Design a protein around this ligand. Structure first.
Ligand code: NA
Lengths: 100, 9, 275
């Protein structure tokens, strides 16, 4: 059966400035089948206040989803997104890197 | 949505 | 200038854990406006854009009735396809359907589409003329014969060339502030050493709408396609999109490299330089 691996991106909605409210996004795209676990992490702990988009797909049939939460960046806090899917042998963690 | 033409395969 | 309306449907079986999950979404261009989820409490088609909220009770009742009928047919399909492919109940399977219509800058019909997939691969699709079918495998020929005998293409063509286009035009008018805008990309490049002898160059496009955009790198005017990392265009969450392209280059060679951005909101394509 076809399986396609999620392509995971973790990023802020607006350019990050410490102390200014913003949104943290984890966009997962290009996956099949649709069953996927996505958590946003703060200092390695799961964030509870997380919304997501309605499941849709691209022209090649692969799915995409956005997970998002409001946040206020600081110097010290580390953010990440943890994703599991059949194509991944263990959950994959992608760290937010604000200096890309 | 389409109200016609959506059939079972 | 040009616009599209598309509906996307996904049904997934979950053997021994109840009925299949069914999710439907509709988009105008890159803007979602409706959803239905079989697992949700409301059991209604629900608005997802501010400009569709003004549609009255007849619209929401009618869209809910139609989306439930779509849910029921895709539910049956999951069983039918398991029969066609001699599959067991050990595993979950996925059906996807997408259909809709494109118009040009003058809002006249360009083309229509209706495509179906099973387990992530093409199954059957309407041809460009909307009068005949492309079936991807032997099991889809069976569907083709059944759909030809039931005159499905004639019904779909009528919807896609008529009703779909009429409602797209209504949405483009009612949602004009959102749908008939173009937000040009805000662009820049970043530079970061990865070692004492190489640097990552990353070309950024932010805050653009619609999502279609091209970012490319050149070295002395030659395209660097094979050496470029290009990420999927992603939503910012506010109705605009972002994308980047990167190359890793030897330090000292930055001035040979240029990033090129094309987007419908730009008066001219941009070339970004390190000199
Ligand atoms: Na896994």
């Amino acid at each position: 059966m076809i399986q396609r691996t999620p392509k995971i991106q973790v990023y802020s909605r607006h350019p990050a400035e410490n102390g200014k409210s913003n949104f943290l996004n984890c966009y997962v795209s290009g996956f099949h089948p649709s069953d996927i676990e996505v958590d946003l992490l703060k200092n390695g702990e799961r964030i509870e206040k997380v919304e997501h988009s309605d499941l849709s797909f691209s022209k090649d049939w692969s799915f995409y989803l956005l997970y998002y939460t409001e946040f206020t960046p600081t110097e010290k806090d580390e953010y990440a997104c943890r994703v599991n899917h059949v194509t991944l042998s263990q959950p994959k963690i992608v760290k937010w890197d604000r200096d890309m | 949505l389409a109200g016609i033409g959506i059939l079972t395969v | 200038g040009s616009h599209s309306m598309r509906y996307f449907f996904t049904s997934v079986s979950r053997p021994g854990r109840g009925e299949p999950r069914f999710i439907a979404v509709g988009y105008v261009d890159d803007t979602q406006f409706v959803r239905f989820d079989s697992d949700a409490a409301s059991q209604r088609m629900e608005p997802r854009a501010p400009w569709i909220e003004q549609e009255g009770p007849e619209y929401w009742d009618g869209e809910t009735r139609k989306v439930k009928a779509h849910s029921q047919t895709h539910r049956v399909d999951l069983g039918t396809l398991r029969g066609y492919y001699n599959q067991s109940e050990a595993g979950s399977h996925t059906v996807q359907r997408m259909y809709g219509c494109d118009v040009g800058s003058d809002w006249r019909f360009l083309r229509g589409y209706h495509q179906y997939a099973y387990d992530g691969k093409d199954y059957i699709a309407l041809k460009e003329d909307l009068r005949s079918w492309t079936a991807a495998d032997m099991a889809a020929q069976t569907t083709k014969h059944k759909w030809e005998a039931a005159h499905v293409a004639e019904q779909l063509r009528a919807y896609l060339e008529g009703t779909c286009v009429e409602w797209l035009r209504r949405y483009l008018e009612n949602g004009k502030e959102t749908l008939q805008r173009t937000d040009a990309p805000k662009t820049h490049m970043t530079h970061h050493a990865v070692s004492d002898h190489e640097a990552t160059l990353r070309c950024w496009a932010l805050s653009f709408y619609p999502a279609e955009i091209t970012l490319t790198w050149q070295r002395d005017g030659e395209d660097q396609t094979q050496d470029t990392e290009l990420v999927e265009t992603r939503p910012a969450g506010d109705g605009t999109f972002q994308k980047w392209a990167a190359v890793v280059v030897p330090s000292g060679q930055e001035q040979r490299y240029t990033c090129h951005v094309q987007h419908e909101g730009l008066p001219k394509p941009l070339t970004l330089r390190w000199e």
